[PDB]
């Protein structure tokens, strides 16, 4: 066809023009003008929680685009998935893993 390849050309031109724009912006900035504590473990914990819940979110991303095709069976399966996810979240909240204030 022609519309899809036209949109591919438009998107490729968009990406290369934006990247070249930022690169030449830095090039002009660098080219023009004269010249003359202990890291707490809570950051790792919240980053790891983000990783795990992002993988569970990816499963829900896959489900959400085909809810009608899976029917009520898929709804029950996803409800079990979400309930396990929420039980893990409640567990993390209650053991103080997500509490930052002392």
């Amino acid at each position: 066809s022609t519309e899809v390849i036209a949109h591919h050309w438009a998107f490729a031109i968009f990406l290369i023009v934006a990247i070249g724009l930022c690169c030449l912006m830095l090039v002009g900035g660098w080219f023009l003008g004269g010249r003359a504590l202990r890291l707490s473990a809570k950051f790792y914990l919240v980053a790891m929680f983000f990783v795990i819940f992002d993988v569970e979110a990816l499963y829900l991303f896959a489900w959400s685009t085909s809810i009608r095709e899976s029917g009520w069976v898929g709804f029950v399966e996803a409800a079990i998935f979400i309930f396990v996810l929420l039980a893990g979240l409640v567990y993390l909240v209650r053991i103080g893993a997500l509490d930052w204030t002392p």
Binding site: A41, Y44, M48, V51, I52, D54, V55, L58, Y59, A62
Partner: protein, 100 residues
């Protein structure tokens, strides 16, 4: 249009590179990095195989593989932090107290 053997060869190359990085590095962090490279190469191989047969099982195996990658990375980095806490170094030759 893309041969299946070419995608499988690419995945094998990346798996071999990840295994080499896992072996030759004394630092625990680069060993975890090599593990991530190996499991991502295996997941890429599953995607290539699924796209060859036109089946949706390859991306499902990719999803399970990256779930394993995320959880193993989490556990390995927690162990790395514990090792750095209680020994102040990440050289894996020093973690050899059990032998024989």
């Amino acid at each position: 249009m893309i041969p299946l053997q070419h995608g499988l060869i690419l995945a094998a190359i990346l798996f071999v590179l990840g295994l080499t990085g896992l072996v030759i590095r004394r630092n625990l962090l680069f060993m975890l990095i090599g593990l991530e490279i190996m499991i991502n190469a295996s997941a890429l191989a599953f995607v290539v195989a699924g796209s060859y047969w036109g089946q949706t099982d390859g991306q499902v195996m990719y999803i399970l593989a990256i779930s394993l990658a995320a959880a193993e990375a989490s556990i390995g980095l927690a162990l790395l932090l514990q090792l750095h806490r209680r020994r102040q170094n990440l050289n894996i030759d020093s973690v050899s107290e059990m032998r024989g």
